[PDB]
Amino acid sequence: TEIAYGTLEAGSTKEFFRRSKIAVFEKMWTYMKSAEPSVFVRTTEEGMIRVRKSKGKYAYLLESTMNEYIEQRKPCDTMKVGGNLDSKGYGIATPKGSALGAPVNLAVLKLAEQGALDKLKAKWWYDKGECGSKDSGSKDKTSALSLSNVA
Amino acid sequence: ANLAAFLTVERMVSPIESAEDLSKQTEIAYGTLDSGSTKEFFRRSKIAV
Amino acid sequence: KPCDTMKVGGNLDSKGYGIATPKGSSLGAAVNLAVLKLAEQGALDKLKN
Amino acid sequence: RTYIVTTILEDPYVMLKKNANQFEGNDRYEGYCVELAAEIAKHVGYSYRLEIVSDGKYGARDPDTKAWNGMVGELVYGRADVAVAPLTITLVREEVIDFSKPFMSLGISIMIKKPQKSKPGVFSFLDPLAYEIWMCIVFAYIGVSVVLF
Amino acid sequence: EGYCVDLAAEIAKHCGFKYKLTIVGDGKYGARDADTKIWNGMVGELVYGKADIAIAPLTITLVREEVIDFSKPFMSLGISIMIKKPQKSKPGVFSFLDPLAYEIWMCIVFAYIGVSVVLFLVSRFSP
């Protein structure tokens, strides 16, 4: 109950917790709907300010791709934890009754089986970003003791 | 104090965490199935890892 | 059982199982609507849990 | 023939270039969906045109007016041809426009402040008891030495 | 009974049709031989009309799209790493220098030698 958490004030994210049937997410929406003060933000940067000025006392929920992209931006002070809560996915849009939609979907499946989508994912999230190659590091798991007392 | 801290919790951790941990070492081996699209994914991959 | 293994790391590729129908079938679009309805209601995650 | 490709300015999918005023045509933009549409045009072989949406909305159906807006309204009312954008595939959007197979799966995650190993040095030594009881300890030390002498 | 049984029950509930849960004969998922050009398994059952619909974990590929159709994926997944649970392993001699330091013991020994040299320089220089 110490670290508060919230979502965006408008969108299908709040409609996901409002229409949820799981009692865990129902308690989440009950806490966020009865929060004092309001945990909801207007924009993404408002949630960024609410996280960065909290020193670990407030969290924010968002999509995983945007979260990992913000994790791959300076000052490299965010990280994405846990698995995904729902099974969402983006696809190429076309109107109903269009003849090009099936060959476009064939091209999408061709790019997915050839792994070029993962190549563009490595290009535009890992290489383009301003954070070093991480997720772990020079063995940052503190096993024994910090040497600062000894120093 | 630190020896009591070791003898108190005893929370063992895993040595392998990410996918790059497999390429980072060579002592712990790893394998896939002899037939299937899983091995074809590694055979047709273009990522240097 | 014996609860002796664990899974680490995220997913390495984009895989997904879906309902298969023959080409030129009339039921494929209502089956797709039913799959989308079960996905948005979270009943698939309920059966997964 | 022709073909209208629409999107919205979102990072890192659709980004303005550095010399955007020094560029023209479809090469003024860059990112994920730009090279995605380039690969689709490579594997299909058609002429396209990158378009920017006017209202800045993704897609919504006002039930009072019964009218979709955004790129959904562009596809329904024929203002665009193929929409390449990160649009969430829902139940209400399938009945009006078609969709391909999902190329990138995603979900709801948790963002934290990412705490580092912010451990001080000499200040960490005098942590566990106090920074003021030690002075009384040294005072009682010199007092007991006065008692002994 | 299982996951796909209740999934087919939900499909028949939200679509309103009688179903018949049948088992594939050869126990194969689906493949096309390069010689015969014949799909087998439930793929061959759907192509050659032996089946009507397949509710099973069949991997949606491009070569399967060329003969039959697929809906949106209800369950996304990927390739993961299967390792065992890390239990306690016998540490042995490394427990003598396990806690608090891996390199600072040599610093303690160096400070020991330094304090010894300074104490000898103080104690043995009075005349």
Ligand SMILES: O=c1[nH]c2cc(C(F)(F)F)c(N3CCOCC3)cc2n(CP(=O)(O)O)c1=O
């Ligand atoms: O179709 C939709 N596609 C969306 C795509 C994205 C992304 F691709 F990640 F940019 C986002 N963002 C994630 C949160 O920060 C702002 C941008 C929102 C989307 N929304 C609004 P929702 O109602 O909250 O889902 C849609 O409606």
Ligand SMILES: O=c1[nH]c2cc(C(F)(F)F)c(N3CCOCC3)cc2n(CP(=O)(O)O)c1=O
């Ligand atoms: O369409 C396919 N669907 C598959 C579905 C599954 C399962 F997960 F059981 F549903 C599996 N297994 C993975 C691990 O458990 C044992 C079998 C293999 C499949 N394969 C073979 P692939 O070529 O290696 O993908 C297919 O071809």
